[PDB]
Amino acid sequence: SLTEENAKTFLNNFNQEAEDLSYQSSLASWNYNTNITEENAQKMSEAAAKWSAFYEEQSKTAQSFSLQEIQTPIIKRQLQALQQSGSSALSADKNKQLNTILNTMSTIYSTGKVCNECLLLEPGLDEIMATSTDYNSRLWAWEGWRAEVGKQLRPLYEEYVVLKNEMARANNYNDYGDYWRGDYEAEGADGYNYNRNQLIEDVERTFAEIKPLYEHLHAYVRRKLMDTYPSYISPTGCLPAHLLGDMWGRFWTNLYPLTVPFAQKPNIDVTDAMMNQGWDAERIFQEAEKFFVSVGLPHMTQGFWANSMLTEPADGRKVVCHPTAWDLGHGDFRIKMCTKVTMDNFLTAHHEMGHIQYDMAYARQPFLLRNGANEGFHEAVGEIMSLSAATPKHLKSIGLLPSDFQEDSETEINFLLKQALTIVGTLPFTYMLEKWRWMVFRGEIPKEQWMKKWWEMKREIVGVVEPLPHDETYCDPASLFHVSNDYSFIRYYTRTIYQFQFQEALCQAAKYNGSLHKCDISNSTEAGQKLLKMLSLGNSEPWTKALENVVGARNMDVKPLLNYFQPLFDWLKEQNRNSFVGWNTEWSPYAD
Amino acid sequence: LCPFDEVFNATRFASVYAWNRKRISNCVADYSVLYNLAPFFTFKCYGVSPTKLNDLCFTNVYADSFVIRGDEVRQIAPGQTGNIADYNYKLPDDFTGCVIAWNSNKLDSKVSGNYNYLYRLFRKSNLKPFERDISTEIYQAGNKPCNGVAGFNCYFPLRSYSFRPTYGVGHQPYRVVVLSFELLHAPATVCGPK
Ligand SMILES: *[C@@H]1O[C@H](CO)[C@@H](O[C@@H]2O[C@H](CO)[C@@H](O)[C@H](O)[C@H]2NC(C)=O)[C@H](O)[C@H]1NC(C)=O
Ligand SMILES: *[C@@H]1O[C@H](CO)[C@@H](O)[C@H](O)[C@H]1NC(C)=O
Ligand SMILES: *[C@@H]1O[C@H](CO)[C@@H](O)[C@H](O)[C@H]1NC(C)=O
Ligand SMILES: [Zn+2]
Hints:
Chain A: This is Angiotensin-converting enzyme 2. The complex is a heterodimer of chains A (about 600) and B (about 190). Chain A is built from 23 helices and six strands. Chain A is mainly α and about 600 residues long. Among the domains of chain A are: about 5-85; about 280-380, no CATH class. In chain A, β4 and β5 form a beta hairpin. Chain B is mainly β. Chain B has two domains: about 1-110 and about 165-195, no CATH class; about 115-165, no CATH class. Chain B has two helices and nine strands. Chain B has helices at about 5-10, 85; strands spanning about 20-25, 40-45, 60-70, 95-105, 120, 140, 155, 160, 175-180. The radius of gyration of chain B is 18 Å and the shape is globular. The interface between A and B is medium-sized, with 20 and 17 residues. The site of one 2-acetamido-2-deoxy-beta-D-glucopyranose has 6 residues of chain A, from α14. A molecule of 2 linked components (NAG-NAG) binds next to loops of chain A.
């Protein structure tokens, strides 16, 4: 219990300096993003270098304190987050090679091009993979992108994997996959501990219950593609990867125009009625603030309205035009978005306002603890608000939809099908990719069996088959942005689970008496107080307690997810009764 | 009349760690002019009420002016605890006077940061009521001597306020003015108008 006031004073001084340094760095980054110039770029780089140097110097000293001797929970947590060095564990030459390989792979990815026609990735090729409906048109693109990017990235990934493994081993971790799993690790009492090795068991058990719904969605989509790809779809086989409406099959949203349940009754789009009423940029954020106040959350500060860039500047300034909630610190919250008069823009503004509210929640916690419980709670806190705002009753009350509008059963089915294609479709992909990456880092898949096991998993778990045989020279995983660039991918699965968990938890607090997908938490102070009970904690307490504060449970549970798509589940069960549920893994298009 | 124009309308207020003090001896006072600006989130009176200030007469009044964060203004009160209450400015548990403060973002804030205001971050012990410490020696936190060089377990006590125009709303500068109505078995001089 000795030598604790020293660590307390160290944390106090560290916070005092880091708050100002982070404010400076965030302001520089904001000035750069809102005004792209070489001067702003140099200022941002200098600020980032200063902040990195300060943080690294303070972390090197943080390791001097033996954490096991500290007894105060909050001080122990503050020390634990700062003691983790990470990349600094490697030597000079090891970091040399690691950064070289990483940035070279990033440049090979961004600067990738396919030549039979010649279209870049973001323009042209993605538009093809999204809208194109011809077999060869998509096949040649899907083959060329890989043969051009993954074949060049393969020799670099074989070294990057071992480099990251060496980096993790220096940090007392087993492998790099185990290092990423540390984000969900939790410490506390007996009823709040969460072993790092238990994440795989939860991910597997949670996926075992989603297979039926995903299997039915796959059986339904497969038949609906036979009308457009007759000789390229099998009645009992897997789906071709290039026919998933995406370069990698991550999102099936592009398949909605073809797999629509009912074509004679489309979805809702209040863009026309929104523009006719004179809804400008700020009008949307005003409605978002009103909604967030109806649940009992704080109001928006005048500083936010004054500093935020809620409209594309006509002064010719270059902007990255990407939605992002900014928390510059010291109460300086801002939103950066080229707001337009549309419904997608409305939902994104709601999501960013939810992010800002979340950031405002835990502002009372120490600087080192001003972060979400985990990488899944952040996006979910905004996704739940976006869902609550998409209810037809909410749009009718706001004045966009006429009060005479009566919701129909077919429109709800179409909306749920689109959501599943955009939500349920990516759940198996993320799990498969994360499991493959873990097995690679752990050394369970030798370098001579990367693509073989990758495609076997694609066929078994995801039910996707390749159009042409790929040998060990190809690297399909690296063809994805999140694989080339070092970014954890399991965050999306946990986010998809936690968003539905919170939606089902707050609906009970709001005393709803209807379907979950039509739940509107608006005008329910009890719902916000229960949610704010967790947003204020942030990273102060283990994520288990944060989840218990809202959902009541201490771990992931996919039952709310299945409850959300329960109508779509029964609809698919009634429709997929016209086919064989499942898919075979021994069938392939290249079996000519 | 009393020189209230010098306490509030000063072109530059003192730091919380070096709060200045001014006293009244002879002339008449007037409390109805303490209206620096419309929103006065800080008009807390202790031991007295604002409506009877004119009728009551005191021997002398001490006015302490200093700037602190908006979040720290609540710490200026009898019996409160905090970095400002313990290490910068402590009020007695039974204090009679008036605490006045107002926003000063337009004046004491700059885009590049106004590092002219400072505060004491660490101190070996809490300050006594109405105590003012302006030392600058290093704060020894461990079992090693502070040899005048800052470093691990040897931190500088004073830190700077980086007031900015967009510095939120709680961290913005607030010009505080604490009026202590000292009264004793002495000739009363600070009376109200007649
Ligand atoms: C946007 O970028 C421009 C690039 O020129 C910035 O302009 C310079 O700003 C410095 C400091 O503001 C001035 O001393 C120079 O004279 C400026 N050049 C011009 C063209 O005036 C500009 O400040 C940045 N603007 C915004 C709005 O962030
Ligand atoms: C929310 O509350 C306001 C005020 O009572 C009311 O006008 C509006 O109809 C309510 N809307 C919802 C979503 O129930
Ligand atoms: C400071 O001068 C202004 C006039 O510019 C006056 O209104 C204000 O009351 C003065 N300050 C005080 C509290 O005496
Ligand atoms: Zn985002």
